[PDB]
Ligand binder design. Structure first.
Ligand code: BEF
Ligand code: BEF
Ligand SMILES: [Mg+2]
Ligand SMILES: [Mg+2]
Lengths: 290, 292
């Protein structure tokens, strides 16, 4: 039962040694916008050298796997394999492929409220998109992602497809909003998903943290022992909650969305699923254990 | 009076109407569907007036300011109504905001509005200054979410920016989630936009329209209404009927609109008593057989 203590000194050396791997959230953890978190690449390198597995799990649905891989390299994280990178975009594509196969054939298409990266992730899995060239097949699912082209007419069209009860509704994540480097905020997929759900009268299947699905998607590709895995993230209600649900050890870093006091407030309120085991000022602080 | 969803006809209809001082009518799906009146609706209103029963009208429709809504009634054949009898969520939003945003002269700021020109006009008639109107946009002191056919990701973003300030109010006209169109398709309702704005801003909106009691308050500032002796007549269980229950009125579901008898009956069998109408009719025309 999580106590939100500062991970330093001996405990930190013990926690890292016991670890098989570290699951890292990306935004607010490795970088903020185009500014990397100092020590972050050096941390990853030392982790690898110490033979501790690293994986990356992000609710960001803007970047397909190849562009996310480029971003890591560009910002200075070398030696990563694309296979280590999980976004809600990737896992939505895999969930939709799973739900849409069958003994039946001639499936259908996905209507996507989202950007080019999310679309590209679905095409890479072999799904067809409403609005691509050629045949208009039956729309069999609506996917809601981070959609800067969101509009009333696109909301209306989503709901029309959802009048068919067999048409699925999937959302990449419910993150409600995100910080920008200028201090302003941008609405998150959760706000778009809420509009689509309310207008269509449906409940969405949510793929991203804190949904366990994000973890299944990962364990299909790697063996992960939740007991010996650290889940590291900056957001209490997505990363920490996810970590608790998966039975992992949880580390809040303070470089991102949540504050140490928000965590303490959950603790005093006895909401244990939202309380991290440990916190650090920065993921750079983890290095003193290697 | 625990609702049993009974068909209002015969003696029950004569009794209920006889005890009533007045009838509150929801408008869409009740007096009309689109540009098509419900047959008998104009005659009903006339006969109600002759019988000395007061009528008032509530709508969650935020598209027409009160003058145009009044012109609509007249054009479709409803005679004898005065504009002051018409309460829309637009009107009541303008009043809530006028109440909450008066203060010293210099304090007065602006309302950032997600909605159409009807709603805009309703707020200006109440003396409110609007972001996006000509000249200086003063401090935004409230965000209003209404039915917004021009809703967009950037305007959602701009609303949230205003809402970062905890003292900026968030008001929604209503939470109706979607509405039927004449071709059988649907348009998203304010409730869906409001949900997006509330989620992205981390705020709870003050809701003005039915089933919020605020709409009833907005009405009782202008007219004496005894809820015990008033019928609330509507086509939507989750908005009109619930509203009637919260205000302590006898509730009548009419079937010419959004909800079905079977939806009402399922609420009954589930014990969701606040979503069960006391009575129902196929059409509000049926009410006429209870008047002499
Ligand atoms: F990249 Be994480 F979801 F902030
Ligand atoms: F006019 Be009601 F709000 F349908
Ligand atoms: Mg993050
Ligand atoms: Mg109605």
């Amino acid at each position: 039962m999580a106590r939100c203590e500062r991970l330093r000194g001996a405990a930190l050396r013990d926690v890292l040694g016991q670890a098989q791997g570290v699951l890292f959230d990306c935004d607010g953890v490795l970088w903020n916008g185009e500014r990397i978190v100092p020590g972050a690449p050096e941390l990853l390198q030392r982790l690898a050298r110490a033979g501790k597995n690293t994986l990356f799990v992000s609710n960001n649905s803007r970047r397909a796997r190849p562009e996310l891989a480029l971003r890591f390299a560009r910002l200075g994280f070398a030696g990563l394999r694309a296979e280590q990178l999980f976004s809600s975009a990737l896992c939505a594509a895999r969930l939709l492929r799973q739900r849409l196969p069958g003994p039946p054939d001639a499936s259908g298409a996905v209507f996507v409220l989202g950007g080019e990266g999310l679309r590209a992730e679905l095409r890479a899995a072999g799904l067809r998109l409403a609005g691509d060239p050629g045949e208009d097949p039956r729309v069999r699912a609506v996917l809601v992602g981070y959609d800067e082209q969101f509009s009333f007419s696109r909301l209306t069209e989503a709901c029309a497809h959802l009048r068919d009860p067999d048409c699925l509704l999937v959302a990449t994540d419910r993150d409600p909003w995100h910080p920008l480097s200028d201090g302003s905020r941008t609405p998150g997929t959760g706000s778009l998903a809420a509009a689509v759900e309310t207008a269509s009268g449906r409940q969405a299947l949510v793929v991203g943290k804190p949904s366990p699905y994000m973890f299944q998607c990962i364990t299909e590709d790697f063996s992960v022992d939740p007991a010996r895995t650290l889940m590291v993230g900056d957001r209490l209600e997505t990363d920490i909650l996810f970590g608790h649900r998966c039975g992992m050890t949880t580390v809040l870093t303070l470089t991102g969305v949540s504050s140490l006091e928000e965590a303490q407030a959950y603790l005093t309120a006895g909401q244990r699923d939202l309380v991290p085991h440990y916190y650090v000022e920065s993921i750079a602080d983890l290095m003193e254990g290697l």
